[PDB]
């Protein structure tokens, strides 16, 4: 069993408590 928690999907830049597009688009 596993537990995952996130706001944005895999392949994003999560830095400074915010997730923005860069490595996705």
Q: What technique determined this structure?
A: NMR
Residues 7/18, Cβ–Cβ less than 8 Å: no
Contacts of 12 (CB under 8 A, 6+ apart): 19, 20, 21, 22, 23, 24
- Calculate Rg over the CA atoms of the chain: 10
Number of domains in the chain: 1
> What distance in Å separates the CA atoms of residue 5 and residue 7, rounded to the nearest whole number?
7
Sign of CA dihedral 19, 20, 23, 25: positive
Grouping H, G, I as helix, E, B as strand and the rest as coil, residue 19 is: strand
> What distance in Å separates the CA atoms of residue 25 and residue 21, rounded to the nearest whole number?
6
Q: Which domain holds residue 6?
A: 1-25
Residues 12/22, Cβ–Cβ less than 8 Å: yes
Helices then strands, counting H and E runs in the chain, come out as 0, 2
Residues 23/9, Cβ–Cβ less than 8 Å: no
């Amino acid at each position: 069993f596993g537990v995952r928690v996130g706001t944005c999907p895999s392949g994003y830049v999560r830095r400074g408590t915010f997730c923005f597009p860069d490595d996705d688009y």
